[PDB]
């Protein structure tokens, strides 16, 4: 119930590949940036998880 | 720092003490004078001296006093000034002399204040208000 909510939240914010030459937030299947500043590129990393 | 006042900050009270202004220590401490080095909350211009009206926190140094305090930049408060200013009332007040007090960076006067303290100052700093004999 509560975990579901958390996962939903993550879905739109946290689970997105976050580029590198750019820092554009994309989507978990990404292999490009869709930015003509980034030059599309193929430097996608995951967006990091929470840490205290 | 702090400032916590009051709730605005007044209701400005006129430039009176530019920097390089010597004023009376008006406080139970070793200091007799207070040379004003600069005033807190002065964003500049281009050849304009920082100035302290009343209730301005003023980085200062003791020119003449006991040598335990001298040769040391230190925080103080302008508590009354000879340069007149308009209040809400309508009336223009001015005092007999330029004067400040000693204080912590937070605005804590540890001595008791000699002479009139000026209502604006009282309104601003609570500790100052407490230690005043005369606010009038």
């Amino acid at each position: 119930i509560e975990p579901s909510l958390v996962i939903l939240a993550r879905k739109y914010k946290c689970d997105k590949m976050i580029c590198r030459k750019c820092y554009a937030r994309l989507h978990p299947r990404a292999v490009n940036c869709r930015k003509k500043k980034c030059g599309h590129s193929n430097n996608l990393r995951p967006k990091k998880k929470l840490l205290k | 720092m702090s400032k916590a006042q009051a709730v605005g900050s007044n209701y400005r009270v006129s430039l009176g003490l530019p920097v390089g202004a010597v004023m009376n220590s008006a406080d139970n401490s070793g200091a007799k004078n207070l040379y004003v080095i600069a005033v807190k909350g002065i964003k500049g211009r281009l050849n304009r001296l920082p100035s302290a009206g009343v209730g301005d926190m003023v980085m200062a140094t003791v020119k003449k006093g006991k040598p335990e305090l001298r040769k040391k930049v230190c925080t103080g408060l302008v508590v009354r000034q000879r340069k007149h200013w308009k209040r809400k009332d309508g009336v223009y007040i001015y005092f007999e002399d330029n004067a400040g007090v000693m204080c912590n960076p937070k605005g804590e006067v540890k001595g008791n204040i000699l002479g009139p303290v000026a209502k604006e100052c009282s309104d601003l700093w609570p500790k100052v208000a407490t230690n005043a004999g005369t606010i009038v």
């Binding site: 579901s4 909510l5 958390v6 939903l8 939240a9 879905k11 739109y12 914010k13 946290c14 998880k49 929470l50 | -």
Partner: protein
């Protein structure tokens, strides 16, 4: 380039009636009436009878070819919406302040007072045609409903994006109203 496209067909149920004039369709169904324009080159968009609407493209580029399918999909969506409407269930969540949502169907608007302890009453008007209704399961959801998917989704998006603190860490908080079930359609 310039390969000659085939047709893209979309089925039409006998519940609805699809008009088309000047490369600009109009589905009419029981629920209402959606309208949409499509502007392209040599895109013959015709009716076979009252069972198939066809979209064509004589000598398409790759770009041109791509958009045909999109067009078809959009008309399918319209068809769907005007016979059995779209329903987006949005769940809202934050880990301390209870987010106060309340609908006003007179204004056709959702308003959110609390969400991060923000004392603003964050509101935005829902798009034309669509409505929300205050559905409860434990004070956790709002369910938007509509004819047009395009509008409905936009509405959802607006209240999603707005409902989010825009200062410091995005992972730490869960603040927002997010779309949970979007594939569901209102029952008839």
């Amino acid at each position: 380039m310039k390969v000659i496209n085939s047709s893209r067909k979309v089925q039409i149920p006998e519940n609805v009636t699809v008009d088309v004039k000047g490369r600009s369709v109009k589905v009419t169904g029981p629920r209402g009436t959606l309208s949409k324009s499509f502007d392209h080159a040599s895109v013959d968009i015709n009716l076979v009878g009252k069972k198939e609407l066809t979209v064509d493209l004589w000598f398409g580029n790759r770009k041109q070819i791509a958009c045909i399918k999109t067009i078809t999909s959009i008309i399918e969506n319209m068809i769907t919406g005007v016979t059995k409407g779209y329903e987006y269930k949005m769940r809202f969540v934050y880990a301390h302040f209870p987010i106060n949502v309340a609908v006003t169907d007179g204004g056709r608007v959702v308003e959110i007072r609390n969400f991060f302890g923000e004392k603003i009453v964050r509101r935005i008007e829902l798009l034309d045609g669509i409505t929300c209704y205050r559905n409860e399961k434990a004070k956790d959801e709002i369910v938007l409903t509509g004819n047009s998917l395009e509008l409905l989704s936009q509405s959802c998006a607006t209240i999603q994006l707005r409902s989010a603190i825009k200062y410091k860490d995005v992972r730490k908080f869960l603040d927002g109203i997010y779309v949970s079930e979007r594939n569901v359609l209102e029952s008839n």
